Amino acid sequence: NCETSCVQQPPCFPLKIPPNDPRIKNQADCIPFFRSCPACPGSNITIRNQINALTSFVDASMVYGSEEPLARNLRNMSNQLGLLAVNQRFQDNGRALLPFDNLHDDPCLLTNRSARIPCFLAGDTRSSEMPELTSMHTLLLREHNRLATELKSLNPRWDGERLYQEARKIVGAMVQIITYRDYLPLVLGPTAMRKYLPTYRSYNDSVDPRIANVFTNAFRYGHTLIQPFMFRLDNRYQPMEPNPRVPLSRVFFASWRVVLEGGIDPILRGLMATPAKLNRQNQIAVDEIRERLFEQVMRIGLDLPALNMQRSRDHGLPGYNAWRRFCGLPQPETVGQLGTVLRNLKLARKLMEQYGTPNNIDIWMGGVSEPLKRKGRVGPLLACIIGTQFRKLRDGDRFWWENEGVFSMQQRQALAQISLPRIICDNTGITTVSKNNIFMSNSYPRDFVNCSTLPALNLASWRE
Amino acid sequence: CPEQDKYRTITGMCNNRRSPTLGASNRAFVRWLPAEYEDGFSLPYGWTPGVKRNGFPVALARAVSNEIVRFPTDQLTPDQERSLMFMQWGQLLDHDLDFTPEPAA
Numbered sequence: 001n002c003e004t005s006c007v008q009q010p011p012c013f014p015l016k017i018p019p020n021d022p023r024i025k026n027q028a029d030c031i032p033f034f035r036s037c038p039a040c041p042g043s044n045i046t047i048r049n050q051i052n053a054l055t056s057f058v059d060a061s062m063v064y065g066s067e068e069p070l071a072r073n074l075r076n077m078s079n080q081l082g083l084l085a086v087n088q089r090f091q092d093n094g095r096a097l098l099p100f101d102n103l104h105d106d107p108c109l110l111t112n113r114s115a116r117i118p119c120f121l122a123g124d125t126r127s128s129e130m131p132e133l134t135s136m137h138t139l140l141l142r143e144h145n146r147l148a149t150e151l152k153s154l155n156p157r158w159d160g161e162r163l164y165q166e167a168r169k170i171v172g173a174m175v176q177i178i179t180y181r182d183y184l185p186l187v188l189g190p191t192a193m194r195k196y197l198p199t200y201r202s203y204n205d206s207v208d209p210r211i212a213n214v215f216t217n218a219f220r221y222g223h224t225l226i227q228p229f230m231f232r233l234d235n236r237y238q239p240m241e242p243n244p245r246v247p248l249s250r251v252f253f254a255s256w257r258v259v260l261e262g263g264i265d266p267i268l269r270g271l272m273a274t275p276a277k278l279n280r281q282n283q284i285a286v287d288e289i290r291e292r293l294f295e296q297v298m299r300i301g302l303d304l305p306a307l308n309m310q311r312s313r314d315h316g317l318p319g320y321n322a323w324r325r326f327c328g329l330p331q332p333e334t335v336g337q338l339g340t341v342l343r344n345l346k347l348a349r350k351l352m353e354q355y356g357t358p359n360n361i362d363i364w365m366g367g368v369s370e371p372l373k374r375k376g377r378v379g380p381l382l383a384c385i386i387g388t389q390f391r392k393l394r395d396g397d398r399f400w401w402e403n404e405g406v407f408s409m410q411q412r413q414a415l416a417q418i419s420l421p422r423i424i425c426d427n428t429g430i431t432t433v434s435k436n437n438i439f440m441s442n443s444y445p446r447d448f449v450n451c452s453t454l455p456a457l458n459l460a461s462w463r464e
Numbered sequence: 465c466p467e468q469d470k471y472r473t474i475t476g477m478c479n480n481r482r483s484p485t486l487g488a489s490n491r492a493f494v495r496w497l498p499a500e501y502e503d504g505f506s507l508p509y510g511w512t513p514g515v516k517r518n519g520f521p522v523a524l525a526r527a528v529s530n531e532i533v534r535f536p537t538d539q540l541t542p543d544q545e546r547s548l549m550f551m552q553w554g555q556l557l558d559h560d561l562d563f564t565p566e567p568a569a
């Protein structure tokens with residue numbers, strides 16, 4: 001049992017504890033770790049590889065599911081309205097919450113006994129991991145139902161299946177737009193955006209759209225953005241008393257906070273009007289995730305950065321210089337060379353003391369150590385890996401929103417007007433929201449506008 | 465695969481008509497570089513006491529975290545040009561792209 005034992009026997013690969021650890025004094029203890037399922041269990045032929053349970057495509061599978069029985073179960077099959085199922089016990093000031101899941105060992109119930117609020121059911125199994133994530137899932141559920149409702153008014157003869165599919169297509173396109181127009185340019189910065197995501201031309205059926213094993217580790221750069229609190233703000237964008245800043249180690253799996261502490265509006269305001277954490281070389285990731293990850297629900301607090309490194313080993317990922325080489329970037333061999341690459345000899349020396357050679361630095365560690373690209377939030381190595389993956393997901397998706405045949409020209413024109421602030425206006429009680437770009441805007445009231453200034457999605461071109 | 469279709473499948477099957485599992489769920493990841501395991505094919509670096517990687521001892525993941533990642537939370541620098549929504553969209557997006565399953569306890 002990898003959760004309760006420190007024995008290293010398959011499928012367990014527990015993290016051992018160093019001497020003088022700041023938290024775990026017993027060196028016979030361990031941080032629990034299950035090896036990722038192998039694609040070919042028990043093989044003496046294959047080189048072990050791991051499995052992606054989801055669709056690689058940017059298709060909102062986190063809302064709809066990636067397997068047919070789950071996808072059916074997420075739908076409201078009581079009627080012909082093409083809706084997703086909503087919570088039958090609770091609403092958030094008259095607006096929909098996600099349905100509850102039925103888990104054997106439900107971790108959300110552990111976070112508050114008296115509340116008895118279980119985990120939510122969504123297209124992905126992680127939707128209750130933090131209330132900020134739950135809030136985004138809930139926002140997309142509402143948006144689906146809003147579109148299906150509007151499409152039924154527009155097209156009264158459409159059946160449930162048609163309504164569901166047309167609203168699903170729109171939600172997928174909105175996720176693609178927000179991601180490629182607004183989010184990625186701010187991850188990569190302008191030079192890397194131009195290099196790895198040049199202007200879209202059309203679908204190329206020879207582009208492999210799979211997620212690469214390395215991207216599952218590299219895209220964890222986002223752990224460096226995480227703040228140690230969940231911030232909740234009222235309708236004046238002021239701290240919502242009496243607990244406006246909850247430590248992250250008391251929000252993991254805390255679905256009760258969404259249901260019984262004010263719904264999604266205060267959380268979404270907190271996200272818009274609070275800065276992200278900046279990744280700096282001596283401020284890489286916070287202790288709420290390095291020391292106290294899932295502390296409420298488990299026998300010991302996990303260390304997310306450490307898990308990332310153990311995971312890259314579990315997955316057999318090459319080290320830092322091999323990935324530099326893959327990307328066409330120079331590979332440092334000495335502490336002096338690594339210091340140049342990092343603009344930081346102190347950090348280079350610390351890395352060499354742990355790893356001996358930059359050949360052996362784990363990909364997450366090396367990737368998050370590099371200085372950030374201009375107007376981006378990753379360095380050159382992570383920019384290459386991330387930018388390369390997202391180009392494949394775009395050019396290799398037959399259902400990419402701009403590909404001819406997916407939407408009409410008029411539907412594409414209407415879709416181009418969407419924004420995440422408008423989606424928030426349409427599906428919540430929030431009336432003042434971030435100015436575009438939402439991912440940059442972070443200070444109230446300077447960067448905020450009223451909802452009435454934002455164009456809403458015009459569905460006229462969906463009338464048949 | 466249907467020769468015409470209008471909507472995505474739920475599993476992602478049939479997006480690529482020539483290789484119809486590509487991007488579909490419950491399939492192996494693509495490798496951009498060949499894997500590196502202690503025995504070549506299955507055991508991870510750090511599995512076997514005393515086995516070096518490319519000439520050097522393997523650092524404990526928790527030691528690296530302690531020595532390089534750990535910092536005093538009061539030093540946290542807020543990003544003047546990104547919101548926390550920038551973090552949160554990333555996580556939500558990751559959950560559209562990949563989930564790597566593990567065996568139950």
Ligand SMILES: *[C@@H]1O[C@H](CO[C@@H]2O[C@@H](C)[C@@H](O)[C@@H](O)[C@@H]2O)[C@@H](O[C@@H]2O[C@H](CO)[C@@H](O[C@@H]3O[C@H](CO)[C@@H](O)[C@H](O[C@H]4O[C@H](CO)[C@@H](O)[C@H](O)[C@@H]4O)[C@@H]3O)[C@H](O)[C@H]2NC(C)=O)[C@H](O)[C@H]1NC(C)=O
Pocket residue numbers: 204205206207391392395
């Ligand atoms: C559709 O997309 C595919 C795949 O493209 C790759 O992914 C895209 C997302 C994008 O990043 C592309 O830049 C990227 O290549 C395209 O097909 C690839 O096309 C390239 C270029 O022809 C092929 O590369 C060649 O590979 C050969 C060995 O396998 C190699 O010998 C060739 O190198 C020789 O020739 C060059 C030029 O003379 C010379 O400079 C070299 O020094 C060497 O002698 C060259 O590297 C890929 O293998 C192709 N990949 C696949 C899967 O087929 C395709 O062109 C594109 N089509 C359109 C219309 O966009």
Ligand code: HEM
Pocket residue numbers: 129130133215216217219220221222223225226304307308311551552553554555558562563564565
């Ligand atoms: C908002 C809070 C975040 C978390 C809580 C969280 C936690 C995890 C955990 C527990 C894993 C698995 C660790 C392991 O290997 O055992 C995990 C993996 C992934 N991260 Fe995490 N993280 C949160 C936040 C983010 C952000 C902001 C991300 C990106 C911008 C992000 C990415 C991911 C990815 C891609 C993975 C691997 C997923 C897979 O199974 O393939 N995280 N994080």
Ligand SMILES: *[C@@H]1O[C@H](CO)[C@@H](O)[C@H](O)[C@H]1NC(C)=O
Pocket residue numbers: 076078079083084085086087088
């Ligand atoms: C199905 O939709 C109807 C109409 O909106 C609603 O009354 C009912 O609660 C929905 N059922 C579920 C399980 O979401």
Ligand SMILES: *[C@@H]1O[C@H](CO)[C@@H](O)[C@H](O)[C@H]1NC(C)=O
Pocket residue numbers: 112113114115256260
């Ligand atoms: C548990 O939930 C209730 C609301 O049901 C709340 O009043 C109580 O403070 C919560 N417990 C903790 C430890 O936060």
Ligand SMILES: [Ca+2]
Pocket residue numbers: 054055056057058059060061062560561
């Ligand atoms: Ca997907």
Ligand SMILES: [Cl-]
Pocket residue numbers: 086087088089098099100
């Ligand atoms: Cl329910």
Ligand SMILES: [Cl-]
Pocket residue numbers: 234235236429430431432
């Ligand atoms: Cl408001």
Ligand SMILES: [Cl-]
Pocket residue numbers: 212213214215494495496497
């Ligand atoms: Cl890979």
